[PDB]
Amino acid sequence: MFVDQVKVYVKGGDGGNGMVAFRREKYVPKGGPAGGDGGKGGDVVFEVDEGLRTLMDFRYKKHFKAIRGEHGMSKNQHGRNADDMVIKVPPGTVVTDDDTKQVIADLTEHGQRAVIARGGRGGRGNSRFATPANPAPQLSENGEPGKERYIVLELKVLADVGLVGFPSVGKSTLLSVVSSAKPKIADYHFTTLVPNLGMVETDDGRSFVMADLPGLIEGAHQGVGLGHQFLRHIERTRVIVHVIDMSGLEGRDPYDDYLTINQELSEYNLRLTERPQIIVANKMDMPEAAENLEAFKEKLTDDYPVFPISAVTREGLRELLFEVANQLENTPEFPLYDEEEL
Ligand SMILES: [Mg+2]
Ligand SMILES: [Mg+2]
Structure with missing residues (x-):
């Protein structure tokens, strides 16, 4: 679409x-x-x-x-x-x-x-x-x-990387900062679903399509056969960039939000828990944020690389996109069913 x-x-x-x-x-x-x-x-x-x-x-x-x-x-x-x-x-x-x-x-x-x-x-x-x-x-x-x-x-x-995390964490402002350009819709003016995706560009020429996973997932749950489309689309998105908060204007416990989100994912039974992940500790410009990452880094047991950045900028995200790109070249698609039909 x-x-x-x-x-x-x-x-x-x-x-x-x-x-x-x-x-x-x-x-x-x-x-x-x-x-x-x-x-x-x-x-x-x-x-x-x-x-x-x-x-x-x-x-x-x-x-x-x-x-x-x-x-x-x-x-x-x-x-x-x-x-x-x-x-x-x-x-x-x-x-x-x-x-x-x-x-x-x-x-x-x-x-x-x-x-x-x-x-x-x-x-x-x-x-x-x-x-x-x-x-x-x-x-x-x-x-x-x-x-x-x-x-x-x-x-x-078709999206390549999916954005997960609590709302207002930055998934949107982030996907927007690196969004060098957005695609066009060819089914425009009806369901007006329009998941939030965009094409980002690294600093070494490489490029890819990023999107907010929730939007794609919610479209894969529509009736009258409209979910299949989004199902395929999800098999395409191979990497997940997890964005947690290290401050909390009203939120608390970083590793907590990490657990909450990662659980939902596995509940949709779509293999979103097999897809490589890249944690993004944002709001690092805050006081408490300094030590929060300290504890967070510990509690973290997965192999997922943590990329902490302050002030979501187009430059301060340089080293992030890079990893997304590299990981993206070493990760396979995630089809629901293989080629076992015979
Ligand atoms: Mg460049
Ligand atoms: Mg359907």
């Missing part, structure tokens, strides 16, 4: 211009065409790479231009075909022309690639235009221009 969309400009290589030359040896004479042909320009090619999860790259650079083919040379030596510009895109990416509004490619398998903007053919040299009434032609072909087109990339968005 959520999809990311980005428009960019792609252009294939123009392709080398043919040459105009002649064999000029010290044979007391001169003549005979020798201009080599041009090489084809390169293609802008999209390739699927499961390692990717968001179209966040196409946001910092929306201009992809392939290299031009090689120009023809004398000695009838032709130019080689320029290498293509391969651009890695997430699985399930649909590419359409922002004009002919057509589907250029529907990339879905890893390694699956498609020609997005093809490069022009190389221009033929003079050696090609020689006829009996033109033994020494001065005609040459310039390279065929690489096609340029404005495209839009569409992607079906």
Whole structure:
């Protein structure tokens, strides 16, 4: 029900211009065409790479231009075909022309690639235009221009990390601070459920989709067959970032809230207790918060890494997102049933 969309400009290589030359040896004479042909320009090619999860790259650079083919040379030596510009895109990416509004490619398998903007053919040299009434032609072909087109990339968005914890703890303000961008809804204006999810971006290029688990879970409990959708979506979210409070404007006992939340999770019987977790001790800027984490760290018996941060900032969360990313690359999906049907 959520999809990311980005428009960019792609252009294939123009392709080398043919040459105009002649064999000029010290044979007391001169003549005979020798201009080599041009090489084809390169293609802008999209390739699927499961390692990717968001179209966040196409946001910092929306201009992809392939290299031009090689120009023809004398000695009838032709130019080689320029290498293509391969651009890695997430699985399930649909590419359409922002004009002919057509589907250029529907990339879905890893390694699956498609020609997005093809490069022009190389221009033929003079050696090609020689006829009996033109033994020494001065005609040459310039390279065929690489096609340029404005495209839009569409992607079906599915959460990767889930946010749990008491309300007002920060799950919302947090998911918002790191939320470099939010998806669009394609079922808009009815159930208006709209779980709270967003695409965050680390500082090393990596990126992923984060959401507030409760919202997803509550949608997986709707009737008239509307839960299945959210069930699948939950199998997708592989990491859990637990946010506890270390102060308590009206709350008390940190390790307590940790127990309360982790229990509910296991009660939904969805395997949310198997999913890796990353505790986030927030509100660390408070007095009591200093020693609370001291005790909390002790009582904690799990292997889950604790990331304490003060003032939810886009920078002070640098080391957090990083872990989320690393963990995310070492954790498998959580399907309810395996491939044991036979
Ligand atoms: Mg960065
Ligand atoms: Mg249902």
